[PDB]
């Protein structure tokens, strides 16, 4: 058994389905609160009514004192003889130390961290795990709030990514019968402000495996040897755990064309990119890990990151068409109080170039302009002012109709 | 007069004291042990004193270690880098808000 | 409000346990702990 599911999800309960000032929600959150208070009371009584204790077996303190109080951590490198291994400290100073008993001489292996004494400097224990606080921090444990209900309609893309990352888990009977390996790599590309990170959030919200999230220009350190090692440890911790998934965002900071030039720092960038490229698909194995990689311009990527076998599915997010604008407007104004006058038809049809974030900004600007004159309900002229007065930076082309 | 001289004598007594190291916590442990990372180099397992509870201790914090025997001394302000001086303007002898005009 | 506050409280009241030192069963320790392990710190030297 590996570290197992190691699931990452708070996700207490979302049922606020009334979504208004109804009694059902009040009674439901009452049930939630009283269960939480009940569990708290149980743990208080669990910790308060413990009467049994000796817990030293008249020798545990003996072992504790035999080993030094401020034990230090070192790196074993060889074991020439029984009871006379050879270790080293941080500064690279080796020492022909001894090995004492009360240390299971089974799990020690060259390259493993061990616990050492001060005054005599012998081996007295083995440190079980060593993960720096740059990889454990990357992990997520509280799921973000959104879900598929909020997406404005992307049926093709949603179905695609679901066949990629979700379906092989819940119902893995078909793929064996057909004899196929499910795809492992996905690219999300397109113009800015369209929804590339929404699918990341929505997938992370509802899943069962570990989720790891990394942003692009963070795999970089200045000591010439930390980048690739950090990448290696990242994939190691992902694979020792559950069927996790990794989300690398804003890649183009890492991978770009691998050309030859002068400066040494850029050589370091290329070295790190190339190490990741090996890690993803190199020699023997890969493991049960999926990778999602998101960017807003794709042509400037190294041809060795995009070839199939490493990234199997590519998904383009295009600008919304007139069918989708109505859905977006219906979602972002659902919890808004609103007047009988307005019709979203004019706003959606008058313009032909805008995206999801733009619609959200139009909604909030119009609502605020309605507030400006001491009202709550929103009218049509407010939406008109919101659309036209701001939310539009411009561009020019094809002058004066050369074509007719 | 007696109080004043007593105070001064006590201060001089206190200044005759040894320093202490500062260390970053990477994680706690069980039965009153912490894993720390002293600044020059080192990865130690240290013990806490009697006036600090472990539940106060969380990863990535600053603790003070007694230099004599490596014990938890106390918990102190969390980390920042040197460049904070230019940030966070501290006094604003600046212009008013009504001298804009137009 | 108080939901999230009590969440914070209940998660703090939980920490971890280790049992990761590699100590062997006591039978393996034998009485060697006193006999030779105690008689092993002082006789030898580091020998860099």
């Amino acid at each position: 058994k590996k570290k197992t599911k190691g699931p990452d999800a708070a996700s207490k309960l979302p049922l606020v389905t009334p979504h208004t000032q109804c009694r059902l929600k009040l009674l439901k959150l009452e049930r939630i609160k009283d269960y939480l208070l009940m569990e708290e009371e149980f743990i208080r009584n669990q910790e308060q009514m413990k009467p049994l204790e000796e817990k030293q077996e008249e020798e545990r303190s003996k072992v504790d004192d035999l080993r030094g109080t401020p034990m230090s951590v070192g790196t074993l490198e060889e074991i020439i003889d029984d009871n006379h291994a050879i270790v080293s400290t941080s500064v690279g100073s080796e020492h022909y130390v001894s090995i004492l008993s009360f240390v299971d001489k089974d799990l020690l292996e060259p390259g493993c961290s061990v616990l050492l004494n001060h005054k005599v400097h012998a081996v007295i224990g083995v440190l079980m795990d060593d993960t720096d606080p740059l990889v454990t921090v990357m992990k997520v444990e509280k799921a973000p709030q959104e879900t598929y209900a909020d997406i404005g309609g992307l049926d093709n893309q949603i179905q695609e990514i679901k066949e990629s990352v979700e379906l092989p888990l819940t119902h893995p009977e078909y793929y064996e019968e057909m004899g196929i390996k499910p795809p492992k790599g996905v690219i999300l590309y397109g113009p800015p402000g369209t929804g590339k990170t929404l699918l990341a959030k929505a997938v992370a919200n509802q899943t069962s495996a570990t989720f790891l999230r990394v942003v692009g220009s963070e795999l970089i350190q200045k000591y010439l040897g930390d980048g690739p090692k950090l990448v290696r440890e990242l994939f190691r911790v992902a694979e020792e755990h559950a069927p996790s998934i990794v989300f690398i965002d804003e890649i183009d900071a890492i991978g770009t064309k691998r050309y030859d030039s002068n400066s040494g720092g850029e050589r370091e960038i290329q070295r790190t990119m190339l190490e990741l490229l090996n890690q993803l698909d190199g020699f023997d194995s890969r493991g049960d890990v999926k990778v999602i990689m998101a960017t807003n311009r794709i042509e400037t990527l190294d041809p060795a990151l995009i070839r199939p076998g490493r990234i199997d599915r590519k998904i383009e997010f295009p600008l919304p068409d007139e069918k989708t604008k109505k859905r977006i407007f219906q979602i972002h104004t659902s919890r808004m109080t609103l007047a009988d006058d307005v019709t979203l038809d004019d706003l959606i049809m008058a313009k032909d170039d805008l995206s999801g974030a733009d619609i959200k900004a139009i909604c909030t600007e119009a609502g605020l302009m309605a507030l400006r004159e001491r009202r709550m309900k929103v009218t049509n002229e407010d939406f008109k002012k919101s659309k036209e007065n701001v939310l539009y930076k411009k561009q020019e082309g094809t002058p004066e109709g050369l074509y007719l | 007069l007696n109080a004043k001289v007593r105070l001064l004598r006590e201060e001089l007594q206190l200044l005759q004291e040894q320093g202490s190291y500062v260390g970053e916590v990477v994680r706690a442990m069980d039965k009153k042990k912490v894993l720390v990372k002293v600044h020059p180099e080192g990865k130690f397992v240290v013990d806490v004193d009697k006036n600090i509870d472990i539940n106060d201790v969380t990863p990535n914090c600053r603790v003070a270690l007694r230099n004599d025997s490596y014990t938890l001394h106390k918990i102190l302000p969390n980390k920042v880098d040197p460049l904070v001086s230019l940030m966070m303007v501290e006094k604003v002898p600046d212009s008013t808000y009504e001298m804009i005009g137009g | 409000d108080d939901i999230q506050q009590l969440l914070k409280k209940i998660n703090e009241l939980t920490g971890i346990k280790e049992s990761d030192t590699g100590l062997a069963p006591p039978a393996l320790w034998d009485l060697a702990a006193d006999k030779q392990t105690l008689q092993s710190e002082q006789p030898l030297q580091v020998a860099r």
Binding site: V91, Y223, L224, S263, G264, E266, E268 | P40 | -
Partner: peptide, 26 residues
């Protein structure tokens, strides 16, 4: 080809110091 380039850095190894031995041999 003008230069606006940058570079990484290797560490400073010299950090060790001697300490008084405290062996107890009769």
């Amino acid at each position: 080809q003008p230069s606006g380039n940058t570079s990484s850095s290797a560490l400073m190894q010299g950090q060790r110091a001697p300490q008084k031995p405290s062996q107890n041999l009769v």
